[PDB]
Amino acid sequence: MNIFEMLRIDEGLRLKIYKDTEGYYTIGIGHLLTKSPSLNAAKSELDKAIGRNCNGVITKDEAEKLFNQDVDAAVRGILRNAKLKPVYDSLDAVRRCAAINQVFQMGETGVAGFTNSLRMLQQKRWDEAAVNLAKSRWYNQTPNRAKRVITTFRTGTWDAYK
Ligand SMILES: Cc1cccc(Cl)c1N
Ligand SMILES: [Cl-]
Numbered sequence: 201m202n203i204f205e206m207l208r209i210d211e212g213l214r215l216k217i218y219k220d221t222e223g224y225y226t227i228g229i230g231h232l233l234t235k236s237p238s239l240n241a242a243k244s245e246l247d248k249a250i251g252r253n254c255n256g257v258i259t260k261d262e263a264e265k266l267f268n269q270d271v272d273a274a275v276r277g278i279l280r281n282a283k284l285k286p287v288y289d290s291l292d293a294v295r296r297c298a299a300i301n302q303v304f305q306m307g308e309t310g311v312a313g314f315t316n317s318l319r320m321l322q323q324k325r326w327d328e329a330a331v332n333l334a335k336s337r338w339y340n341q342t343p344n345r346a347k348r349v350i351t352t353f354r355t356g357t358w359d360a361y362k
């Protein structure tokens with residue numbers, strides 16, 4: 201298992217514009233296109249990202265390209281963040297995948313506000329961090345997926361991804 205397969209499991213793959221769990225226009229492998237509710241704004245963003253007139257539909261290769269760029273950006277985002285960087289670098293490889301997953305789903309922002317959890321993860325207080333992580337809107341809104349990520353942080357293994 202690696203970050204790609206893990207996220208592909210958590211986000212799925214769709215080739216036509218769709219609304220995410222929050223109701224925002226998205227496409228491919230969880231690539232958010234816009235928070236605005238104008239489908240047209242979404243389509244414009246799509247053409248801009250892909251570089252062609254898509255008309256709301258892409259190919260798998262295209263989706264995959266977006267996914268690559270998005271994984272990359274997330275990691276980079278982590279590394280450039282001063283509150284994040286240090287925690288990330290203290291983790292083993294599996295748990296780092298769980299960190300990238302959260303950033304991919306919620307933005308560097310959204311994460312940067314899990315201060316107490318971050319500290320716990322940094323001190324390597326696994327069970328504590330897991331309980332604290334669950335006390336969040338994130339776990340309450342997307343509990344199955346949050347469960348998987350939390351187990352991953354808790355255990356350092358891929359068991360939740362089976
Ligand atoms: C989102 C994130 C970035 C870096 C380190 C950690 Cl532990 C987390 N959760
Ligand atoms: Cl792009």
Ligand SMILES: [Cl-]
Nearest residue numbers: 342343344345
């Ligand atoms: Cl879920």
